[PDB]
C-alpha cells in the first residue's frame, strides 16, 4: 500500500498564527491528495481535494498545495475552531490509504505541575494489590517524565501514564503515573517516590512517603 | 442535506459475528459507491470495504486485512449499506464509519461512527478506592475506579456541586482486559475540615453505582 508519513505528529499553534503541516507518500501520487478535519468526538469532514481545492463551506484560510510526494495543509491564521486532528488521503492508486494525522494543539507559555503522591488505601490492600498514584496538576508543555523509585530501585514496566484532554480555560494538561505492585510486593520495600522533570521546573520535584506511616 | 447514520456496534468476544447497518440519505443512493471506514488508536484510519453501484455490477472491494471475513452488501430500496463481520479479532476492534466515496476520490460524506468493541474479558464493576488528601494552600484528593469492564463509566463529585478542578484521567487498559482510571480534584486546604469530598462512580453496563467518601486518612 502507498504509505503516507504525516508531520509533525503534534504541531502547537498560537492564536493567529499562521502554521502549516506536512503529509508525504511513500511514492509518487500526482495531485491526489484530500485533507480532512476531525474535532474532538467528531467525523471527519473534508476541506482540501486533488491537493489545492478548497470544497465550497471551508474558509479562505484553509490553503493546500503541493505535488508528487510532498503535501502541505496551510491555515492562515488559526482560529479556535481549527483545534482539530488533520489527516490526509490519497486515492492516486488502490488501495487508498490515509496518514496518521496532525493533531493541532494550543500553544502558551510554560507552567509548572503541581506533584503529588498518593499510597494505596487500606481498603485496596486487603484485596491482595497496591496501587500508587502519582499526579501532575495543570501543567504546560506536555512533555514530562515521571519515574518511580522504590527503596531507590528504578521502577521499569510496572506503572501506565494517562493524560487529560487540553484544558478549555488555561490549555494545560494534567497526567496520572500508576504503578501496580501486588500486596506481597508492595509489603517488601519503604520508601515510594515519584520524581518528576518538567521544562517549568528549576529542578525535578520528588514526593515520597514512608509505606505505613501518617 | 446528506445524512449517513450508523447502528449495530457493540460488545464481542473473539471469534464472534456483527452486523453493521448505515442509512442514507440526502442524495441518488443507488449511483454512488458505498464504503466502511474504520478508526483506532493504534492504526489510524483504515479503509474497510467499499460496494459500487448496481450500474456496475455493485462490485465488492476488501481491505486485505479483513477479506474472507468481512462482507459488505447495499439494499438500494431502503438506501442502506451493511458490513457483516465474522471471525471476529481484538485487532478488529475500534470505531466504524459509513462514508461515501465520490467515484474512486474523496470520502466526502462521513457518518457519525459506530464503536466495535472485540474482548473476551467479562463485564464487571469497578472497585472505588479513596486517594486521600496529604497531612502535608491546596490539597489533592480522589477516587481510584479500578477494574471494571467495559467503557464508560462516569464519575461526578459531591453529587454534581463540585465541578471546579476535577480531572477525570481517560481509562487505561490493563493487561488483564479490565480499565481503570483517576478522578481527581484540587481544593483548599482550608477547607478539609468543613467540606466533605464524595465521589459518585456509575458504570451502566453492570448497573453498578458506588458513593465513596473520601477524607484525610489517621
Known amino acids: 500500500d502507498i504509505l503516507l508519513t504525516q508531520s509533525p505528529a503534534i504541531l502547537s499553534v498560537s492564536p493567529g498564527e499562521r502554521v502549516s503541516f506536512s503529509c508525504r507518500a511513500s511514492?509518487?501520487?500526482?495531485?491526489?491528495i484530500h485533507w480532512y478535519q476531525q474535532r474532538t468526538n467528531g467525523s471527519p469532514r473534508l476541506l482540501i481535494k486533488y491537493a489545492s481545492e478548497s470544497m465550497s463551506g471551508i474558509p479562505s484560510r484553509f490553503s493546500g498545495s503541493g505535488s508528487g510526494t510532498d503535501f502541505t495543509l496551510s491555515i492562515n491564521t488559526v482560529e479556535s475552531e481549527d483545534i482539530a486532528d488533520y489527516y490526509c488521503?490519497?486515492?492516486?492508486?488502490?488501495?487508498?490509504?490515509f496518514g496518521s494525522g496532525t493533531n493541532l494543539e494550543v500553544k502558551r507559555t510554560v507552567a509548572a505541575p503541581s506533584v503529588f503522591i498518593f499510597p494505596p488505601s487500606d481498603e485496596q490492600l486487603k484485596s491482595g494489590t497496591a496501587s500508587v498514584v502519582c499526579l501532575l496538576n495543570n501543567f504546560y508543555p506536555r512533555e514530562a517524565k515521571v519515574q518511580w523509585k522504590v527503596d531507590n530501585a528504578l521502577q521499569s514496566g510496572n506503572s501506565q501514564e494517562s493524560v487529560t484532554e487540553q484544558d478549555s480555560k488555561d490549555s494545560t494538561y494534567s497526567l496520572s503515573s500508576t504503578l501496580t505492585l501486588s500486596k506481597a510486593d508492595y509489603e517488601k520495600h519503604k520508601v515510594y517516590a515519584c520524581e518528576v522533570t518538567h521544562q517549568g521546573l528549576s529542578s525535578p520535584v520528588t514526593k515520597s512517603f514512608n509505606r505505613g506511616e501518617c | 442535506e446528506v445524512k449517513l447514520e450508523e447502528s449495530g456496534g457493540g460488545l464481542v468476544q473473539p471469534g464472534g459475528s456483527m452486523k453493521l447497518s448505515c442509512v442514507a440519505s440526502g442524495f441518488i443512493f443507488s449511483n454512488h459507491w458505498m464504503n466502511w471506514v474504520r478508526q483506532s488508536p493504534e492504526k489510524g484510519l483504515e479503509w474497510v470495504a467499499e460496494?459500487?453501484?448496481?450500474?456496475?455490477?455493485?462490485?465488492?472491494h476488501y481491505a486485505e486485512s479483513v477479506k474472507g471475513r468481512f462482507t459488505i452488501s447495499r439494499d438500494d430500496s431502503k438506501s442502506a449499506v451493511y458490513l457483516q463481520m465474522t471471525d471476529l479479532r481484538t485487532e478488529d476492534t475500534g470505531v466504524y464509519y459509513c462514508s461515501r466515496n465520490y467515484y474512486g476520490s474523496t470520502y466526502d460524506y462521513w457518518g457519525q461512527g459506530t464503536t466495535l468493541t472485540v474482548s473476551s474479558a467479562s463485564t464487571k464493576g469497578p472497585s472505588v478506592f479513596p486517594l486521600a488528601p496529604s497531612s502535608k494552600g491546596t490539597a489533592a484528593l480522589g477516587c481510584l475506579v479500578k477494574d471494571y469492564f467495559p467503557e464508560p463509566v462516569t464519575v461526578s463529585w459531591n453529587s454534581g456541586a463540585l465541578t471546579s478542578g476535577v480531572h477525570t484521567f481517560p481509562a487505561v487498559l490493563q493487561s488483564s482486559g479490565l480499565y481503570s482510571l483517576s478522578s481527581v480534584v484540587t481544593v483548599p486546604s482550608s477547607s478539609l475540615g468543613t467540606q466533605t469530598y464524595i465521589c459518585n462512580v456509575n458504570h451502566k453496563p453492570s448497573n453498578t453505582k458506588v458513593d465513596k467518601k473520601v477524607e484525610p486518612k489517621s
Open positions: 511514492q509518487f501520487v500526482g495531485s491526489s
Open positions: 460496494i459500487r453501484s448496481k450500474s456496475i455490477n455493485s462490485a465488492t
Open positions: 488521503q490519497q486515492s492516486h492508486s488502490w488501495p487508498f490509504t
